[PDB]
């Protein structure tokens, strides 16, 4: 096949990055994100990215999906910021929540110029890095309702 | 304002509303005309197929009859969903490596004929990956028209590693029609192709070891199944059950020199940077109706293991609703205001023309 005459000829381009960076400017949740070292957490709630209050950071509803932005100083420069972005998928989260969390993780990555390294964290499969962010890790029963309308 | 999501498969239209958990209209992507030489679309054409010759406007993921495709879209909007398209932003889908003119003409028709207020054309496999809750993985998407291998890392498809095989469900149906003649059955016409398609979907499976299965089929009738045709005749099928989808692993069954789906998957992974290959091998996501054969995931797991380094951790993800994964991924993404922010508006089309699709849709 010939990529150049095809519908993927513009994938991987500066143009693709520019369009997606612009789109990420339209999510209020990212304003002010990643400005200092620490952990910031949002939960997906009926397709919306909703902040989790700091007093609850580390507690996750098993029925829900979340985005966790870890901002830290890299070894290369103690006065600059680098990022790990984890999306945490509860054992009982619904498909809309997990899919939004994945898409919005990429969007936060775009917003932060591609710098975040992404980590998919399924409940019970959390990475060593995720476990290191927090007896701060607590799983809560229940969660918020799906954003999907069910087709009978 | 609710967006419409329309996944135009080569064989099936799946259409509905963003935010629903499933497409509300699913029907064959066919136009029927009198077999005796004015047209019917979709479910009604399938019903009246006794007196019609059926044609698919999409072949191998590319629209080849634009007049009939317009009939399909018109039917989707006005007869199935019963919506006024000018009131609904519309998400369409497409397989990768299609010629650029296909989406240019999709865009032109949506705006100039259907007057949609906004639209976007998304890559099918990318939607499926998001439907699975991932940003990294390699999707094997196989419908009626095309089998695609799409590796994606951190939300970006890797164009140099995307692969495409113009062998999928319709070719499998045609091959079953052919091999069924060995038993003395005659399936030839377009109406008969739809019967054999049903036989394929109901009775076919992927053998874990093809040669062993052929021996089992000859030793006794233990693998045979019966099927009642619409005229009442009952036929029996045996090794055709697994010889049909074996073609995915041995394309030479239909005369193609191409590598089988296990080898294309491996080849696509090998075109990716070495450091991400382990993540791709652990995240093979199956998508599409042609991935629905019983046994296919186990066979993939076996064949990729044989090709991959001996210690590679390999996992095949086979979502139960994978016939609708593309649609579901579109329903999710079209529910996000930021994704809709990238859509082409009617004004943008008026000023820029079809070329704008390449600058907005990735
Ligand atoms: N259970 C099944 N086993 C085998 N094949 C099946 C099964 N169910 C559906 N198929 C086949 O899958 C195809 C339709 O699936 P699907 O709707 O995913 O494809 P499509 O979107 O029309 O095609 P494409 O995306 O390649 O253009 C047909 O060939 C159909 O016969
Ligand atoms: Ca939930
Ligand atoms: Ca990144
Ligand atoms: Mg399809």
Residue numbers in the entry:
A (entry chain B): 7 to 140, 143 to 160
B (entry chain A): 5 to 41, 51 to 375
Question: What do the paper's sentences say?
Answer:
Actin is one of the most abundant proteins in eukaryotic cells and plays essential roles in various cellular activities, including locomotion, division, and transcription control. The dynamic assembly of actin is controlled by the hydrolysis of ATP, bound to the center of the molecule. Upon polymerization, actin undergoes a conformational change from the monomeric G-form to the fibrous F-form, which is associated with the flipping of the side chain of His161 toward ATP. Here, we report the crystal structures of the three mutant actins bound to AMPPNP or ADP-Pi determined at a resolution of 1.35–1.55 Å, which are stabilized in the F-form conformation with the aid of the fragmin F1 domain.
In A108G, His161 remained non-flipped despite the global actin conformation adopting the F-form, demonstrating that the side chain of His161 is flipped to avoid a steric clash with the methyl group of A108. Because of the non-flipped His161, W1 was located away from ATP, similar to G-actin, which was accompanied by incomplete hydrolysis. In the crystal of the F1/A108G complex prepared from ATP-bound A108G in the presence of ATP, His161 also adopted a non-flipped conformation (χ1 = −51° and χ2 = −89°). Interestingly, in the active site, the electron density corresponding to the nucleotide was continuous, despite the high resolution of the structure at 1.35 Å. The density could best be interpreted by the concomitant placement of ADP-Pi (occupancy: 0.51) with ATP (0.40), demonstrating that A108G incompletely hydrolyzed bound ATP in the crystal. Therefore, we refer to this structure as A108G_ATP·ADP-Pi. Consistent with this view, in A108G_ATP·ADP-Pi, the attacking water W1 remained partially (0.55) 4.0 Å away from PG as in A108G_AMPPNP. The two active site structures indicate that A108G is expected to have a lower activity of ATP hydrolysis, at least weaker than that of P109A; the P109A structure obtained by the same procedure contains only ADP and Pi in the active site. In addition, in the case of A108G adopting the F-form, although the side chain of His161 was not flipped in the crystals, the flipping itself would not be inhibited by steric hindrance and it would occur occasionally as shown by the MD simulation. This suggests that A108G in the F-form conformation can flip His161 and consequently has ATP hydrolysis activity, which is evident from the partial cleavage of ATP in the active site of the A108G crystal.
